[PDB]
């Protein structure tokens, strides 16, 4: 609906309820593609979310920040669950590798986190 991006249905975003100086023209192309496909009145609807989420990690984190400035609750949850499943089943070092995390734990601070974890069943 005449949505002006920053480089150069529009209601799913409760911040729209125009100038969008925080979202680029590439991420808004995915944002609009998400809302266009969901304004429909199952498996196919949910199978497209995984296909739409087959983006690179750089594009994914731009989509998360976009669906947070813009108030699209259904999109902010879909992109955040993707990052959550990435962390799933990986060792701490594997989690650091995927997201370029630096280990900032002292040898004792990590030992405390381990000792704390021994108080919860898996």
């Amino acid at each position: 609906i005449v949505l002006k991006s920053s480089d150069g249905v529009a209601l799913e975003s409760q911040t729209i309820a125009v100038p969008l100086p925080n979202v680029t023209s590439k991420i808004l192309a995915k944002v609009i593609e998400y809302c266009k496909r969901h304004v429909e009145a199952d498996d196919d609807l949910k199978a497209w979310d995984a296909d739409f989420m087959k983006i690179d990690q750089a594009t994914l984190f731009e989509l998360i920040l976009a669906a947070n400035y813009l108030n699209i609750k259904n999109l902010l949850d879909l992109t955040c669950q993707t990052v959550a499943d990435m962390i799933k089943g990986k060792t701490p070092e594997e989690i650091r590798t995927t997201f370029n995390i630096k280990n900032d734990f002292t040898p004792e601070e990590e030992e405390e986190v381990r000792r704390e974890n021994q108080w919860a069943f898996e």
Partner: protein
């Protein structure tokens, strides 16, 4: 022009605003992944502790290892807290009974420390040996404790007055809304006395589970009456009831109507009759009639989850099911037991249960006139069926199952076929071919035909499998029956019934066939239940030999056989050895006891972590 990027000093997930890092970690529901995520960096550790929604305390809160922890061990947003599996298993936690004043201040310190780590508990589960456990625990959460689950597989203290087990909750927790007593043993007089003499806390209850650890013969009409009349706000009620008309205080037509009138806002009702094989009440009639069920279904317009699993039969129930579709349009989950005449399907149309179009889950136990014509008509009216199941129906064929699987291809995902007469394993697995690539859960009893096995497609979405056997029967012919390739099958549940001293002791050097499940790639969790399977070491070797061949066996729950004259379910020495050879185990839960030290399992299994002897049967041995 487009250059590849090199080493970057920035991490995108850590450059996110911290409220968004909290939001990401809130979808990670795998506990081991949450523990590993808190080890990546100090910022994600703050995110994990601040968004962990639930936790089951592992270890002993009495030991100094917990009471002297840091305050970085703090879960601000934790809602559900499970203090049921605190070690030792089944011991009274924060009790006031001596095994003088030193225990009164020790309980307060352990409660104050538990209130520190979890300061926002709204759902609490605890092993309640005696009511002083609730009295020493609720002070810190009494203002926000909405749901409470009690666990006691032990004997009720003989000196406690009626209702004393639930008094600390009804007197202190003004925020209580859900009381779960499904695994909490107590007399039926206890639940009636407490819930009818506290009209302030009782009048707000909306969820009630009165299972009482399956150790009562059911609540009588003189007991279900006052309980329902005292809780006029119940939306979900689960309780066994005495339905035998041989007793003047059974639950019949009048008891049902009075229950629906005293609780009109019910949306989930699950009444069941405690099974007892000695009586063998197969075709005996019940005190419930179809004429009374129609008036009972007319008083529950908000009913959405109905379950009346009976042993005494209810006849000509076709009009009542038609009334359930009219007076209860939001019905979706229906589980019926010993209901006869559920669907005649004679003048076509869709009589009986087929009129209920909104059904998403249908389960029928002991229906003697449910035939192929019924399953044909059921598939016409119940186009939203996602879970289907028949139990003890001796007129259903493979042609009825196969037709239902084909006509319900889009929605049918879970199927239960237990102890049906004309349905054997190899013949029933072939009937489910129209959904062989779609079915996700399967529960069948194993019956072998000694011609087509040893003596096809791929179940591409089957993730859960449940099997029922008999003592001395083999699992090996299952691969030769149709389940030869299940790629995504991750969990399997096995149960063995029947007497032991009547089946011929299988020829030594034969085994049940646990090793024949190695062909399943991702089979992780197993539930081997041999509790109702009865030299005892010979029978555990028969059922446990080959479990070490399961390379991906991650989590295991084992139920040792009961004893003829002992209250302990001890693991024989070869049973311990065959489980100690499961090197891939992460969690090991033995529903009994063992003479071997609990550390021998930790040394024989390298990556073993969670282990506990959870003796969750009604006569717990009381180890101290």
């Amino acid at each position: 022009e487009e250059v590849e990027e090199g080493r970057s000093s920035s991490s995108a997930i850590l450059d996110l605003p911290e409220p968004l890092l909290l939001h990401i970690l809130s979808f990670l529901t795998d506990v081991r992944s949450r523990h590993r995520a808190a080890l990546a960096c100090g910022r994600m550790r703050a995110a994990e502790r601040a968004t962990r929604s639930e936790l089951s305390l592992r270890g002993d809160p009495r030991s100094p290892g917990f009471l002297f922890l840091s305050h970085a061990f703090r879960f601000p947003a934790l809602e559900h807290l499970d203090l049921s599996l605190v070690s030792p298993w089944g011991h009274p936690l924060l009790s006031s009974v001596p095994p003088p004043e030193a225990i009164s201040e020790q309980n307060a310190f352990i409660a104050a420390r538990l209130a520190g780590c979890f300061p926002a508990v709204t759902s609490l589960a605890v092993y309640c040996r005696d009511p002083t456990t609730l009295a020493n625990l609720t002070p810190h959460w009494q203002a926000s404790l909405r749901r409470v689950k009690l666990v006691r597989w032990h004997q009720r203290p003989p000196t406690l007055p009626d209702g004393a087990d639930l008094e600390p909750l009804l007197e202190t927790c003004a925020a209580l809304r859900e009381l779960d007593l499904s695994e909490f043993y107590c007399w039926t007089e206890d639940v009636v006395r407490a819930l009818t003499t506290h009209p302030s806390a009782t009048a707000a209850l909306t969820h009630l589970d009165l299972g009482l650890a399956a150790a009562t013969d059911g609540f009588k009409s003189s007991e279900l009456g006052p309980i329902a009349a005292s809780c006029p706000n119940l939306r979900k009620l689960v309780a066994p009831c005495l339905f035998n008309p041989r007793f003047s205080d059974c639950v019949g037509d009048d008891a049902l109507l009075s229950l629906a009138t005293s609780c009109p806002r019910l949306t989930v009702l699950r009444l069941s009759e405690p099974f007892e094989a000695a009586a063998n009440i197969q075709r005996e009639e019940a005190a419930i009639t179809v004429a009374g069920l129609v008036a009972f279904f007319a008083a529950l317009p908000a009913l959405e989850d109905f379950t009346m699993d009976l042993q005494h039969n209810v006849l000509e129930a076709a009009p009542a099911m038609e009334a359930l579709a009219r007076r209860c349009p939001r019905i979706k989950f229906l589980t019926l037991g010993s209901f006869q005449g559920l669907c005649k399907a004679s003048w076509l149309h869709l009589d009986g249960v087929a009129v209920c179009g909104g059904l998403e889950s249908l389960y029928m136990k002991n229906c003697q006139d449910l035939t192929d014509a019924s399953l044909a008509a059921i598939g016409r009216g119940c186009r939203r069926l996602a879970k289907f199941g028949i139990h003890g129906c001796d007129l259903v064929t493979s042609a009825g199952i196969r037709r239902l699987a084909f006509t319900l291809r889009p929605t049918l995902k879970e199927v239960t076929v237990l102890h049906c007469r004309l349905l054997h394993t190899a013949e029933c697995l072939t009937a489910l071919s129209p959904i062989r690539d779609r079915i996700e859960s399967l529960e069948i009893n194993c019956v072998w035909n000694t011609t087509e096995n040893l003596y096809l497609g791929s179940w591409e979405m089957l993730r859960s499998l449940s099997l029922w056997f008999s003592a001395g029967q083999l699992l090996s012919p299952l691969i030769s029956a149709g389940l030869d390739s299940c790629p995504v099958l991750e969990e399997i549940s096995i149960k063995v019934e029947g007497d032991c001293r009547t089946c011929p002791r299988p020829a030594p050097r034969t085994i049940f066939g646990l090793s024949d499940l190695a062909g399943f790639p991702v089979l992780a969790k197993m539930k081997l239940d041999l509790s109702e399977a009865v030299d005892l070491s010979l029978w555990e070797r028969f059922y446990l030999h080959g479990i070490e061949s399961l390379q991906t066996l991650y989590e295991l729950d084992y139920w040792p056989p009961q004893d003829k004259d002992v209250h302990h379910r001890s693991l024989t020495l070869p049973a311990v050895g065959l489980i100690q050879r499961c090197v891939g185990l992460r969690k090991l839960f033995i529903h009994g006891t063992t003479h071997e030290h609990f550390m021998t399992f930790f040394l024989s299994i390298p990556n073993l972590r969670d282990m506990q002897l959870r003796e969750d049967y009604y006569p717990a041995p009381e180890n101290d």
